[PDB]
């Protein structure tokens, strides 16, 4: 509880479809982007945390809640764009006479700040008297001991909770989701999604000299001008699809009804025909 682990993963493919065929996870409340539509979404920095709590305390893992474990043991900020996964672990985390291998903090002066782990254990002296490493009436121990017995109903049984801190900051992603690796595109317009970056335009080859550390490529603005192939390392510029304006040449409805269209910005290829300047 107070020593929740953190095993961050990076540079790997995360297929969340495996979690469905596992043990029943009737706690999949994705406080974030989307519970189902998650495989078609890459991540940059995913932090996987884990801890074991009771049953009636799982509702405090949501971003923003009161209680005892959501204020002094493990508190989440009101910006968490991720998912929480919990399941009944009363089959292997609850033994005879109670499993005392889980300790939770009970006495803490101030509220726990976002993403803080209190691994220290000092004698909680609640003021008004100088205490020492002993136990008395006004001086007690901050950490407590959980009693996980199989004779408890829904609410007092152990529940292994594991969350995924999806940062998703603007940066070259490392943890992409599972998707069918399709082929390349010729001088046509597509909806490519190269390494998280989801743009649209003509993917034509270029003659730029990218550096070994460079992945993306921009221009005088924030537009992704060029990019390198993830599995080919080729410099291909990303030019947007052909667009323009439409001007209707009308000689007047009182005279006739024939019109003429002026596709300004086209070379008579992406549309008699007469190319003007």
């Amino acid at each position: 509880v107070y020593a929740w682990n953190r095993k961050r993963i990076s540079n790997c493919v995360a297929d969340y479809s495996v979690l469905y065929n596992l043990a029943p996870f009737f706690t999949f409340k994705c406080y974030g982007v989307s519970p189902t539509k998650l495989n078609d979404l890459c991540f940059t920095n995913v932090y996987a945390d884990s801890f074991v709590i009771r049953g009636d305390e799982v509702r405090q893992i949501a971003p923003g809640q009161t209680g005892n474990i959501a204020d002094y043991n493990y508190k989440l900020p009101d910006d968490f764009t991720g998912c929480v996964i919990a399941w009944n672990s009363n089959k292997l985390d609850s033994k005879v006479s109670g499993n005392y291998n889980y300790l939770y903090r009970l006495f803490r002066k101030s509220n726990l700040k976002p993403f803080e782990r209190d691994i220290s254990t000092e004698i909680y002296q609640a003021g008004n008297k100088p205490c020492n490493g002993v136990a008395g009436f006004n001086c007690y121990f901050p950490l407590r001991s959980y009693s996980f017995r199989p004779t408890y109903g829904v609410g007092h049984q152990p529940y292994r909770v594991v969350v995924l801190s999806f940062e998703l900051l603007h940066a070259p992603a490392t943890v992409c989701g599972p998707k069918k690796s399709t082929n390349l595109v010729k001088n046509k317009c597509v909806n490519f999604n190269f390494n998280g970056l989801k743009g649209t335009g003509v993917l034509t080859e270029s003659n730029k000299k990218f550096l070994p550390f460079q992945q993306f490529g921009r221009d005088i603005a924030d537009t992704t001008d060029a990019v390198r192939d993830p599995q080919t390392l080729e410099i291909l510029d990303i030019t947007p699809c052909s667009f323009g304006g439409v001007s209707v040449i009308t000689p007047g409805t009182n005279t006739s009804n024939q019109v003429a269209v002026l596709y300004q910005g086209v070379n008579c290829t992406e549309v008699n025909v007469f190319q003007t300047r």
Partner: antibody
Framework: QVTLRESGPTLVKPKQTLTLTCTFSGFSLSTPGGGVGWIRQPPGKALEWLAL???????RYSPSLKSSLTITKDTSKNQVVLTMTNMDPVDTATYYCARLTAADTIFDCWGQGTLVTVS | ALTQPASVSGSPGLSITISCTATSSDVGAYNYVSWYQQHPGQAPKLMIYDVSKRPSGVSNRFSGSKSANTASLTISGLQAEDEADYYC?????????FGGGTKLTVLG
């Protein structure tokens, strides 16, 4: 598969310390949720649990008998040994050691039976 | 603990039920309950655990349920090779109870 065999002296003097063992083979005791226990079955009576060990050196015993039941694990040679003192001529029964795979599967695989008469 | 009927009789072909009562049931919700079968001279083998399901290797003759707090073992199609003792077992607050005994005597 799981083979739970017992051994030890069947006939013993009264008021002594039993050394009934349980040699398990076919699985590892270090699995999360595993453990080997002991169940007594008197002739013409019902079952009764005596002791149970786990994968974290925890030794759980019956609340009625705690001053004599002393179980120990020997995974180094895969032989669970049970020791009990103050043997009275009422404990004569066929003992069984079964593996507790998990909480839902309470002692799926059992032993074979060793009658330990106390007279 | 758990109390079970001492003597239960059953005609060959009919079906009989057992009673696994509360008897100061400190088990709580009584979620997990397993039934065993022990023939005279052999070791007790698991017949049905988690009465909502059945283990592999057991025919459909054995089935169980628990209405409110009492587990029942419904054994249909009695045969000569069925006279054995059955036990219901659960998890108590400080031990693992195995209940009482139930001897089946198939007459005829």
């Amino acid at each position: 598969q799981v083979t739970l065999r017992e051994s030890g002296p069947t006939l013993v003097k009264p008021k002594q310390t039993l050394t009934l063992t349980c040699t398990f083979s076919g699985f590892s005791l270090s699995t999360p949720g595993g453990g080997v226990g002991w169940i007594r079955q008197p002739p013409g009576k019902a079952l009764e649990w005596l002791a149970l060990i786990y994968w974290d050196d925890d030794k759980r015993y019956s609340p009625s008998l705690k001053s004599s039941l002393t179980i120990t694990k020997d995974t180094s040679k895969n032989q669970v040994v049970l020791t009990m003192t103050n043997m009275d001529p009422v404990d004569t029964a066929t003992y069984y050691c079964a593996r507790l795979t998990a909480a839902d599967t309470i002692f799926d695989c059992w032993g074979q039976g060793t009658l330990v008469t106390v007279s | 603990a758990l109390t079970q009927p001492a003597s239960v009789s059953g005609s060959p072909g009919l079906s009989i039920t057992i009673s696994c009562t509360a008897t100061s049931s400190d088990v709580g919700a009584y979620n997990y309950v397993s039934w065993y079968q022990q023939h005279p001279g052999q070791a007790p083998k698991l017949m049905i655990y988690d009465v909502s399901k059945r283990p592999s290797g057991v025919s459909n003759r054995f089935s169980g349920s628990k209405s409110a707090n009492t587990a029942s073992l419904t054994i249909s199609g009695l045969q000569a090779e069925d006279e054995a003792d059955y036990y219901c077992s659960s998890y108590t607050t400080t031990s693992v109870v195995f209940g009482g005994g139930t001897k089946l005597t198939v007459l005829g």
